[PDB]
Design an enzyme around this catalytic site. Structure first.
Site, PDB file in Angstrom:
ATOM      1  N   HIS A  41       0.809  -1.224   0.000  1.00  0.00           N
ATOM      2  CA  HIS A  41       0.000   0.000   0.000  1.00  0.00           C
ATOM      3  C   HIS A  41       0.844   1.276   0.000  1.00  0.00           C
ATOM      4  O   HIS A  41       0.329   2.377  -0.145  1.00  0.00           O
ATOM      5  CB  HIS A  41      -0.992   0.033   1.172  1.00  0.00           C
ATOM      6  CG  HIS A  41      -0.398   0.459   2.474  1.00  0.00           C
ATOM      7  ND1 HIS A  41      -0.019  -0.436   3.448  1.00  0.00           N
ATOM      8  CD2 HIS A  41      -0.169   1.689   2.980  1.00  0.00           C
ATOM      9  CE1 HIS A  41       0.410   0.224   4.507  1.00  0.00           C
ATOM     10  NE2 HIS A  41       0.329   1.516   4.255  1.00  0.00           N
ATOM     11  N   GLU A  55      20.328   5.106   7.382  1.00  0.00           N
ATOM     12  CA  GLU A  55      19.668   6.324   7.835  1.00  0.00           C
ATOM     13  C   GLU A  55      19.396   6.196   9.336  1.00  0.00           C
ATOM     14  O   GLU A  55      19.134   5.110   9.835  1.00  0.00           O
ATOM     15  CB  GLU A  55      18.347   6.492   7.066  1.00  0.00           C
ATOM     16  CG  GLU A  55      17.567   7.761   7.341  1.00  0.00           C
ATOM     17  CD  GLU A  55      18.401   9.012   7.117  1.00  0.00           C
ATOM     18  OE1 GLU A  55      19.280   9.282   7.951  1.00  0.00           O
ATOM     19  OE2 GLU A  55      18.192   9.711   6.108  1.00  0.00           O
ATOM     20  N   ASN A  57      18.979   9.714  11.539  1.00  0.00           N
ATOM     21  CA  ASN A  57      18.321  10.980  11.804  1.00  0.00           C
ATOM     22  C   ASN A  57      17.940  11.612  10.463  1.00  0.00           C
ATOM     23  O   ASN A  57      18.787  12.168   9.786  1.00  0.00           O
ATOM     24  CB  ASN A  57      19.282  11.896  12.550  1.00  0.00           C
ATOM     25  CG  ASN A  57      18.617  13.153  13.019  1.00  0.00           C
ATOM     26  OD1 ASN A  57      17.824  13.757  12.284  1.00  0.00           O
ATOM     27  ND2 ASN A  57      18.942  13.577  14.236  1.00  0.00           N
ATOM     28  N   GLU A  65      24.618   7.276   5.272  1.00  0.00           N
ATOM     29  CA  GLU A  65      23.485   7.124   4.368  1.00  0.00           C
ATOM     30  C   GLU A  65      23.830   6.676   2.952  1.00  0.00           C
ATOM     31  O   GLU A  65      24.804   7.132   2.353  1.00  0.00           O
ATOM     32  CB  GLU A  65      22.676   8.424   4.296  1.00  0.00           C
ATOM     33  CG  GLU A  65      22.286   8.981   5.663  1.00  0.00           C
ATOM     34  CD  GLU A  65      23.371   9.880   6.231  1.00  0.00           C
ATOM     35  OE1 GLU A  65      24.565   9.655   5.913  1.00  0.00           O
ATOM     36  OE2 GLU A  65      23.040  10.814   6.989  1.00  0.00           O
ATOM     37  N   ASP A  89      -0.376  -7.446   1.894  1.00  0.00           N
ATOM     38  CA  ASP A  89       0.252  -6.131   1.911  1.00  0.00           C
ATOM     39  C   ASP A  89       1.755  -6.282   2.028  1.00  0.00           C
ATOM     40  O   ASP A  89       2.339  -6.126   3.103  1.00  0.00           O
ATOM     41  CB  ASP A  89      -0.262  -5.296   3.086  1.00  0.00           C
ATOM     42  CG  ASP A  89       0.075  -3.819   2.938  1.00  0.00           C
ATOM     43  OD1 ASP A  89       0.705  -3.451   1.923  1.00  0.00           O
ATOM     44  OD2 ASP A  89      -0.300  -3.031   3.834  1.00  0.00           O
ATOM     45  N   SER A 185       4.610   1.999   7.907  1.00  0.00           N
ATOM     46  CA  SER A 185       4.341   0.898   6.978  1.00  0.00           C
ATOM     47  C   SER A 185       5.551   0.490   6.157  1.00  0.00           C
ATOM     48  O   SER A 185       6.359   1.330   5.772  1.00  0.00           O
ATOM     49  CB  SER A 185       3.201   1.241   6.011  1.00  0.00           C
ATOM     50  OG  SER A 185       1.969   1.189   6.746  1.00  0.00           O
TER      51      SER A 185
HETATM   52 CA    CA Z   1      20.757  11.337   8.346  1.00  0.00          CA
END
Ligand code: CA
Lengths: 235, 59
Positions: A41, A55, A57, A65, A89, A185
């Site tokens: 979804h 990741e 923050n 990152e 889903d 999700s």
């Molecule tokens: Ca960051």
């Protein structure tokens, strides 16, 4: 996540965030270098989407990152076969360029059907994400995580008017106050097996968040384990 | 024998002939010496935290 806590950098190295028309709109988990598993979804419109692994923050730079573009989206073939039910889903995302695995970018383990279901029945798993932490709140800047106990099926049925299929499971506390939420999700429900975490669920839906007498509903990964492995093979 | 304590298998257990236990591990892992435990066979095996906040303990 509501009622959870800040994760520490590198605590859930398999967790990724998805950015697109809306930033941090959903989460995901690394299957391997070229694949991400998430909730269908979250990616129905097939619009352009970005994936950020390593990741922590979302408004800062950790230099851990890794951003990648999604070049193929494979939602489960039966998702939405019955409109608005959230059954099946689950979805898979292929990356333009492979991720470089390191301490902040590590896949999540995925056991067979039998064992995935055995780990789920251990009754305790962790959910994580940059979803809402408060009522009508925006994204959490820092990754959140929460431990949620498994809920017996009968209690699950009696908690909602909506149909809970065998492709789903309930998790949450009787009192409420702690739940995954909007924005989470696609994120993983993981079960820690002696230092090694396995994917046991996909954060999928619920009625509001953290409400007492209500529970988070998750996609039962054991049922899609064969589908995941078949589609994410490295060649 | 899988029956009790997953038959002493750190990850997966299967029942072989003569009530014998045959352990197995997931991708990126290998059957540790004892034929029970699972050990990393790659630099970054699935499901494990290796960061450990740089170094703020005995290590
Ligand atoms: Ca960051």
């Amino acid at each position: 996540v509501v009622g959870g806590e800040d994760a520490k950098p590198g605590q859930f190295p398999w967790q990724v965030v998805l950015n697109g028309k809306v930033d941090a709109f959903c989460g995901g988990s690394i299957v391997n270098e070229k694949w991400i598993v998430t909730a269908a979804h979250c990616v129905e419109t097939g619009v352009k989407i970005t994936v950020v692994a390593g990741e922590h923050n979302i408004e800062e730079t950790e230099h851990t990152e890794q951003k990648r573009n999604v070049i193929r989206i494979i939602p489960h073939h039966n998702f939405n076969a019955a409109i608005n039910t959230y059954n099946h889903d689950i979805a898979l995302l292929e990356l333009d360029e492979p991720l470089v695995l390191n301490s902040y970018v590590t896949p999540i383990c995925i056991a067979d059907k039998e064992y995935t279901n055995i780990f789920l029945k251990f009754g305790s798993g962790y959910v994580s994400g940059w979803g809402r932490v408060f009522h009508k709140g925006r994204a959490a800047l820092v990754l959140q995580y929460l431990r949620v106990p498994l809920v017996d099926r009968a209690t699950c049925l009696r908690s909602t008017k909506f149909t809970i299929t065998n492709n789903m499971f309930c998790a949450g506390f009787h009192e409420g106050g702690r739940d995954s939420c909007q924005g989470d999700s696609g994120g993983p429900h993981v079960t820690e097996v002696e230092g090694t975490s396995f994917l046991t669920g996909i954060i999928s839906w619920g009625e509001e968040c953290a409400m007492k007498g209500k529970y988070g509903i998750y996609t039962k990964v054991s049922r899609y384990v064969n589908w995941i492995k078949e589609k994410t093979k490295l060649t | 024998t899988c029956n009790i304590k997953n038959g002493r298998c750190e990850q997966f257990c299967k029942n072989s002939a003569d009530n014998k236990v045959v352990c197995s591990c997931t991708e990126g892992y290998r059957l540790a010496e004892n034929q029970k435990s699972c050990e990393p066979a790659v630099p970054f095996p699935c499901g494990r935290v290796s960061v450990s906040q740089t170094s703020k303990l005995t290590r």
